[PDB]
Structures are given as C-alpha cells and as structure tokens.
Design a protein around this nucleic acid. Sequence first.
RNA 1: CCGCGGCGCG
Lengths: 100, 298, 330, 251, 54, 90, 86, 18, 110
Amino acid sequence: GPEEITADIPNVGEAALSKLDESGIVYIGAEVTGGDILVGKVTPKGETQLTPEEKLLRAIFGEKASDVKDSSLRVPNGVSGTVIDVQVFTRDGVEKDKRA
Amino acid sequence: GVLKIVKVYLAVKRRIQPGDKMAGRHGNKGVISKINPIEDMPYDENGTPVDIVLNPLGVPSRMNIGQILETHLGMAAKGIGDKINAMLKQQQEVAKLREFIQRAYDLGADVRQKVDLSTFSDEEVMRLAENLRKGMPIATPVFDGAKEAEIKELLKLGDLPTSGQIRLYDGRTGEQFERPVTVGYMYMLKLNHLVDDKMHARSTGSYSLVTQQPLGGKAQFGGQRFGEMEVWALEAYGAAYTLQEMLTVKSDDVNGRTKMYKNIVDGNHQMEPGMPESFNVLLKEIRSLGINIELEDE
Amino acid sequence: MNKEILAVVEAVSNEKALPREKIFEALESALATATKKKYEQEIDVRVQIDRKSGDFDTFRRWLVVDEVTQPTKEITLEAARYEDESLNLGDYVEDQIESVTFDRITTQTAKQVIVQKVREAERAMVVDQFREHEGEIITGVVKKVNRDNISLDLGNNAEAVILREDMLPRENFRPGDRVRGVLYSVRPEARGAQLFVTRSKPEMLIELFRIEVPEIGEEVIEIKAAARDPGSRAKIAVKTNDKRIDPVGACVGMRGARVQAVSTELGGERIDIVLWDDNPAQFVINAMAPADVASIVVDEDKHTMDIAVEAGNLAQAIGRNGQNVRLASQ
Amino acid sequence: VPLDGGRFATSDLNDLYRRVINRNNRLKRLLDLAAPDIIVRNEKRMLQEAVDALLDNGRRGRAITGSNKRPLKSLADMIKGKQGRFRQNLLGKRVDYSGRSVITVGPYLRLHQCGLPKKMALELFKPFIYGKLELRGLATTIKAAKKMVEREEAVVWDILDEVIREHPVLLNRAPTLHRLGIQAFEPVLIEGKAIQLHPLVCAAYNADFDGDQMAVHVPLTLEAQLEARALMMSTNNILSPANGEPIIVPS
Amino acid sequence: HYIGDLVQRTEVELLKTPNLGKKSLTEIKDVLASRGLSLGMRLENWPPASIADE
Amino acid sequence: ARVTVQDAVEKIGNRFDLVLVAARRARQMQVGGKDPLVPEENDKTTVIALREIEEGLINNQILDVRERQEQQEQEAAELQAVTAIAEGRR
Amino acid sequence: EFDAIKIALASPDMIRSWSFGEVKKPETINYRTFKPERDGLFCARIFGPVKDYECLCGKYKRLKHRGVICEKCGVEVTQTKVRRER
Amino acid sequence: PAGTGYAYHQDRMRRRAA
Amino acid sequence: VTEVEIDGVLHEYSTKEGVQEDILEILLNLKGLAVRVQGKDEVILTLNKSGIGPVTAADITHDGDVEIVKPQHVICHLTDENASISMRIKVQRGRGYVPASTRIHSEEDE
RNA sequence: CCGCGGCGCG
Ligand SMILES: [Mg+2]
Ligand SMILES: [Zn+2]
C-alpha cells in the first residue's frame, strides 16, 4: 500500500502532535530539541487478520484507515536547535499540500 | 517508487566550550583547557587584560620563531590604530590625521609601494580613517619579510617599548613578574573538530542482528570498540576477571547481561559466566563447511 | 444513510450476543466520549445515536447545574428564565447535537477507549456467565499464572480467580490441577469480570456429603453435619434418612467410594465420617470420631454435656488442634 | 533487512544458495529427461563450479559480481582476513558502558584521580542510579526511575556523587602501545564535555594535547573493582614494566 | 455594558432576558468557561472588591 | 581514606591472593549482610575490605576457619531445628 | 561447559542428523505477505517460526502451548531463538 | 590461566580433571 | 535586553525587506546597546519609524526612568521608501553573565 | 540495519 504523510500519530502526546500543522509538517521557525518529532508518517500496517474491534469498530466508524503502522521521522538524539527551512518535492502526477 | 520527499534544514548557533580544538597560522595546534573570569588573567599597567595565554615552551622545540615576529608586528600594528582611535575620538582636523597616516605609509626602506593621501579626497580620507580604527592592516610578500630593524622603526612610530615586552600584573597576585613578557595580537583560526560532536557515550541500547554486540558511531548510539592491543595490555596485568567480564557479559552473553541488569538494580554485583554465542556462530560456520567440530564434555 | 451501523448490528456473531442496540448505545457513548476528548472544549455528550436506518447522530448534554460543570456545554440558573424556569442542579437535557466526525486522531482515541468499551461489553457478557446461577457447584481449571493468588484463563466467558486461602494451600490452582466449589461472589476483576473456583470453602468440601454417595443427594442420607477443614480433612456426622442403617460407610463409600474420593478436586484430603444412632449416647460418642466413650452424662438444665472419653488412643477426643471435638458438639 | 519501501537487501550467501539450488533443480530434472552426454556435462560442470564459488569466491571462476565489479562474499571470505570473524569479531569486541572524548589538563587534580564530564556520568551509571533511588524509595518502578532521571531532578546528583565517590574507572587511548596505555583512576565530576587528566600520567600515555581522543570503561563486579584498585591504580605503577626506569618524570 | 456589569449578576440573576437564542444559551457556557461569569460573581455595582486599582 | 594497597601487599606476599581474599570478604559483607570490623567513613564495602586486611586480622585461612565454624554451627542449628520439628508432633 | 575441542571431517549421514529437512525451493520470501515459502531458503517447518510461540497458521499463541506441532503448518511452538542454531 | 585466574585454575586442575 | 520581538520575521536567520542588514547584526547591535533605569525593573521598549536613513537609540520612544547613555548609537539602516520597521524590546535587570542557552529551563512559556 | 570506495584526524 502507499505510505502517507499525516498530522496524526497514535500513542504519542499532543505536545508532540502540536508543533505540526494540519498537513503534518512542523511550523517554520519552531524551536525543537532532541527526541522530538519532525513529520508524522504512517505506513500500511497490513490487515492480515480480523479482530472483533476490526469486525465492528471499523464498520461502525466506517473509517478504513484503520490500524496503521507508524514510521514518523523523529529528531536524532544529541542535536537540537531551530528549524530554518522546509523543502518538499512530490513526484509528478501526485497531489500536493498547502505548504507546497 | 517514492511519493514525496520532505527536506528539513535545521540550524545550531554553537559557541566555544572548553576542550575544543584551536589553532593559529604556524602549526601551533592546541586545545582550550579552561575558561576563567576576566579579572584572573594578567593585565597591563594601562588596565587592558590579555585574552590568550600560550605556552612559550612550544617555540624552541618546534623552531616556530616566526610566530614571535608576527606577535611583535601584531602588537606594533594595533598600536597604530589606537592612537588613530585617540585622534579621531577627540574630533581633530583631518590634516592632522593625513600627515600621521602619511608618516605610516612612507615609513621603512625604499619599498616599491608609494602613496599620497593628499591626492585622494577629504571625505574619503576620513572614511578610510574611520575604517582604519581597528589597527592599520599590514602585509608582507612571502619571501620578502620586513627586517627586524624595520619592525623597531615602525614601533618607534607607535609609543611602545623597543624590545617588545611589557611588565604585567596578575589579578590573583597583583605584583610584577620578575621577567617582562612579550605580548601582541595573534590571528587565530577555528577548526571543525568540535569537542561536542566528538563526545559520545552509551549505557545500553540496540545490538547487532547477525551477532549480538553493540554498534559503533555517534549516530544510532554506537559503543566504543575494544581492540586487541589493549586486550594484551590487560593480559599484562593480572586482570583475569575484568577481561572475562568485559568479553562475555557486556559483549556477547545475551542471557548473562539481562541477569546482571536485574542484579545491578538489585544491588548485587555477581557476574554469571556463560557461553559466547559468537563463538557458537563461528562454530556453526565451521560446521557449514562439512567438517565436524564439537565440544568434548562439560 | 450510511447503513454501516446496520451492517455492524447485523454482523452479528458478537452483535447478537449483546443487544441489537448495545452497539448503538454503549459503543456510541464511547465514540461520543472520544469525540469530546478530541474537542478542546470538553462538552459532555448524551449521545442521541441510533442505528435504526443509518442516521448516526448525537446530542450534547446540558449538565444543568448551578456551576460550570461541563463548562463547554454547561447550563446555569443565569439562563433559567430563558429556559422556561426549569434550570436547576441535576438536569442533563440536550444542550446541543453533533453530526459526524471522521477524526483519525479520535480514531486513535477510539483504539484507546472505544476498544476498551468493546472490552467492557465483553465484561458485561462475562458477568452474565461467571455467576449466572448466583452461586452453584461449578468446576474450574487454571491456565494463567498470577502472584499472591491463582489466576485461571477458563471458560464462562470470563476468567477465574482462586484465593490462597479459598483454595487448597498446598495444591493451588495451577497448570495441571482443577478445582470445584460454589462461590456466590463474582465482582469486577481485571480486564473484565471473572468467575471464582475455590475448592476449599465449606460449599466445596463439605458439600460433597450430598454428591459422593450413590443416594446422598436423593434425600436418602440424613447428613446431620458437614464440617471440613480447607482441603485438609473432615470428620462429620452423616446419617441415613428413614433407613436406620450405618451410614458412616455410606458417607465413606463402598470399598473407598467416598472416603478418598469426596475431596479429590479439593486438594486430595483424607477424611473419616462419623456414626449416629437413635439414642443420645452413641451420637455423642461418635461425633468426635475417633472417640472411645466409656461413660456419658448430660444435664437438661444447662447447655453443658459430659462426653467422657479415654486418653490412650483417643487423641482425637480432645484434638491437638480441634480436629474431631470441634465438629462433635455441633 | 527491511529497507525503505519494503525493499530487502541480504548477504551474498543467499544468492549463492539460490543459484546452487536452482542449478541442482535443473540437473535433477535433466536426470529424468535423459539428455545426451554433451548436455549433462555442461550442467554438472557449471553446478560444480557454482558450488566451488560458494565455498570460495573468485579464486578460479572469478565470481566477482555481487554489486557490479564488487566480489561476492563467500564462506572463505567469512573467516579469512582482517574483516573475517577472528580478528574482526572474536579477539576484539564492541562493548557498552563506555565513552570517548578529547583530553585536557587538570592542575588541581591529584595523581590518583581523573577528570570526568557530568553528562557521561549521568548517562553511564544509570543502572547504579536505578537501584539506589529505589533503595532510597524515591523511585518505585524502573519506569518511574527512568522517567524521573530523564527530567534531571536536582536530587539525583547527590546519589550520583554517592555511587561514584568510591568507584574506579578505566582510561584507554586508542593507539594503544604498552602496559601503561591503560590506567585506572578515581573520577571527580567536572562540568564540560572534556576530560581532565593528571599531566604526569600523560607522559606515560605518550599522549599530546593536540586533540587526542581516548575512551573510558567501567568495571561492575566487586572483584572487578578489587582488581582495578589492586593493579591498575596509577600509584601502583611508577616503574616501567620494560625496565627499572621511573615513569613519573615531570616533563 | 461592563464585563463586571454582566458579572454583577450572579449565576442566577443574569437571566433578565429570555430573548437569547439557543446558541446564545450554548454561548452562555463560554461565560462560564471564562471562569469569571455564571459562577456567582457579584460586584459592588460595576467593579468588585478585588477589582480595585488604588 | 585509601589510596594504595602496598601495606596489604607486604602483609600478604602475593598481589593475586590479595584480590581473591578481598573479593571473598567483600562478598560476605555486601551480599548476606554482616558487620564491618573497622569504623567506616561513608565508603562502599570494597574499600572497607582493604582497611580490614591491612589491620592484620583477616587473611585467607582466617576467612576459611570462620566460614567452616559458621557452617558447622548452622549445620548443628539445622539439626536441633529438625529434631524440634519432629518433637512438635511428639 | 567444556574441556576440549575436537575437529574432524563429517559423514553425510551424521550431517543430515544435524539437518532437520532438505531445502527444495529457491524462493526466499512471499511478496506482499512477507513470510517464507515451504522448503525455501527461509522456512519455518525446517528452521522455525519468526514470531515467538506463534505458528504460521497462528492457532497457538500461549505459553503453555509447548512443543506441539500444528497440522496446518509443521511448525513448533517455541521462541525464535532456536533459529540461531537449527 | 595467567593472572588472578591462575589461582582458580590451580584449584580447577587439582580438584577435578586429575 | 534579553529578548526581542521583531514583527516582520519568523526566526533570527531569516531577513525582512527594506533592511540592509541581517537580523544577527541587529541582535549584536542591540547587544552593544546600553540603557539606564531606576524605578521599574522589567521595562518594555518599542519603536516605529519609516523613511530612509540611519537608526539610533534616540529614535526609541522614551519613558520616565528609561534612558539611553549613548543616544547616537546606531541600531540598523533602512534603504527602502516604504519599509516601516517595528519591534518591541524586552529588557531585564540582572548580574553577571548568562547565556541564552540556559533559558531552556523555562520549558513552559518560551 | 547490509556492505564497497573516498576524505580527514590522531
Ligand atoms: Mg596527538
Ligand atoms: Zn500457525
């Protein structure tokens, strides 16, 4: 399946998911420290089975995201400082976000 | 096979910090040891504190005499700008500056460089003088160095002692040293071998997958790599248990380290000898070639 | 309409086990709580959610009080005259109504909380089967290990727990053992409700007096007393109803059918039943079995009897820790 | 290895096994077809030489292509040479509970002591920290202690001083020459990222102050500390093991 | 007209007008969410005793 | 405090035996707590052993004789404990 | 846990006594469901489960599920560490 | 069997393996 | 001064139209700026000015006890006709030397 | 993560 950039990561605090915009990219000029999150990225976890939660809650919500594997990019330890720039390229024929 | 790339550029305003790598222009490589408050370093009779303290003992051993001459020029050079700073601060008339600067550029022997400020301007001359406040810049061709007598003559244009050393007072003591010391203005570089990104340590993290040892490199939390030379160095001592501990528990014995980790937090410090599976791995590789190898007993 | 709610209600292997509106009420309230948490203004939601035809809706409760309780959707007496003079402390009328929310972040909150609500529905079904008889003689097998107790990943749509004293101490409920007994207390345990198998209580060991002999539970064995230590031993007076025969052997079984077999699931205890008769002396002599009574006396003016006994082979007449005399006077 | 995008890289041995099993399958099919002897000789010879390459790369057949023009790593490669198994992984290991940095002078520092950055102490001795805080009862779980130490409460420094006050540490310079190439000391905490050192020891190390790096290792067991304090103390060694000359000359 | 005038009425007396809409009653919770109104606030007339800047 | 081990070395004429006996002694202090035999100055048991051995009242056989008398005492204590347990039923 | 080391040439019968099966397929891993193929260079009935105490069919996920081999997959119920030596 | 471990191994080959 | 709130900027490494210096030069210039104060202790400064020419501390709007020892000290330089510069300056009283890195201990308002 | 080469430092 296709990997996706999003402003949503499970099992993390809203403090981590606060520097991000709605499109999942940290604000320009936001101060950052070690261990923080840069861009929320999620990858298809693979169904591989169906549980009662996946039997019902997925059907009840209708949201077929549904349980997804996190691959978000985190600050490497030791380094800190301030973000100066965000540069993005998308492959031709693919949608683009607001910061682009 | 890729959708998008996100590039992030991040910046660090990193300052000096003791232990950094520092150097000049004559192979006088060095390292900053300690930063001390201003009053501690020696200061002249005029109150100005020196900035850099260097060891003279590197000079005769390495025959780097030229940096001493460069120091004498630097003291000589900054002397010119200061008086110019004194002249312009008290808003004197420009012709007083002119001849003084005219004294500077006609000094020395019959050098090919000839200038006449009277032909330049007035306001541009004033602007040059303002730009000249931080010491009058001098240059010398590579194999055409100015003679020592010329250096002394240029010092005579300034108001500093001919020999080029000054009596200094130490803030802790407050007394003159027994021997006068040469001071000046050195040009100092800076090196990318920063101490902070050299510094790295590793308590406990991931391990290899093919074998079960920690990795290397400051990135991804690598550990120090213990080489063979120092293994024989410990072997020169009676460091039996140290060597066994370090080569078994904290390197290979997966079950052993976990037990000790339980033991350490429990206040126990008893080592558990085990079986180096890296040897077992190698064993199986030897078994891979169709040659039987085995352990005789317990 | 969405009709996915209708499909979920007609899933229906786990949907029909609970009510058809169980998903439309409990899981809907969980989703409303997840949406309220996803909202910075934490509005209390009395979810008006129905799965009749697919119109998944909601409602925000007023939480009407004289204060700022649920301040995101609160009401007060400062609008009582604007609320038809019916605003006081206690009301939870619908202040607002939500419409829809995809809310992938609240989908993570759903995996945290609505999944816990699915587990809560599982717990509700678990409590409906752990003690469905409100106390009865049932069995139990241990499959999970827990400290300071005996866990059991067993049936009855739930788990089971055995106390260190409610079960056999020397043989706890563990891998390779089973228990049997009656426990009328089934409260909410960890990760949902759980059952209780305890083969050391009186309703487990002493209850074998009507389940061990071939005619014990058919009202053919007048078991006058059922006293037993927890998985240790027993010495009680069991007689035969309208038979006038020696029922000590009947309570002990024929050739070892109820002596070493009445407490097999209790921890392997060794017991010895007592005898009785139509006279008031033989019963008193045998109630402290093994007891040898060469004399008997009783006073009808006070609650004090004189069951004389020897001391040579009558160590159970007085007991080192009350093993036969304690179950004798009663 | 699960690289980016679900692509998988692996050792060359996998490719050798793949080609060997493929050629074996082709041969065992060719047994049933009963091909003429010219055909079967080619099959058996290329199978034999592929097995040969699996045992030893490139010595005859020049199987020099894994990545283009980069020879595939064989089983003979797995043991032979510096980057094999013995010299690469058995005599020399990688260890945790260790660090490295640049050196500097300590003039106030006594001979039987070494400088030490505080940050390495906090990072390194955390297993000792976890037990002692639990001993003090300030922490309750390993999770609690780990969370508490990572916010650097002011109370942790006293306990860290306690656990380090009577513990020895090892100093080793990477270009190891001789027995004095490793020493042991009783550390003192100094702010910074450098390491202070007693200058008289520096002559024994034959180490400059031009930016030389060196490493630290820490013993754990009781007997480890006892051996360290019995033998590798600087005070223990004041004569060269090579000859009866002292090694404490002011330089 | 003052923020202490709407807060001069307590959490009960501020119901002088029922002309406010249904959303306004929901918007009345924002005054409660302001932690200064709809809680029993009672100023002197405009300002309270703690609103003095003397 | 303690800086060197030369006194202990001149006491026990082997550097290697010194570390062994000290490790054993420190093992009985740290695990299975007993008392030290010398006033301490807020130091761990490792230094404490060096104080103890340098005072000339612990050596290898002193530990040996103390351990064997302790083990025979606890064996005797186990004997009376077992006899008392048997007599409890009697 | 030893006192001596012996080295010698091997016999094919005792070699297969080490062996727990023959590899027959050159396929390494199934795509889009990353599990090994039967009798491939990677395998579970030959070498072991990737997940600890979880058969490929996944009908045994329990500590007391010990040593049993499923009928759907000929895979033991044991931690993956045995794959280091099998 | 060189340093402090020699004392252990001296016991090792003496007690057993002899 | 301890911190600045230049309006038309996001971080000290970017620039703003109409200024012939970068923000770092601004920071160092105000670093070399000195003030006088008696009564208040956390005074706040600001400035609004347009036009082409030098920028000096005398251009700062004054206060009661807020004074400038050297009012002719240059701050920056403007070159564009319509390049209205604007900021507010936060000044603190203290002692000794303290780096900006150590302010990370706040961790709740910065 | 797996390795080849390069550069630099000591
Ligand atoms: Mg060097
Ligand atoms: Zn399976």
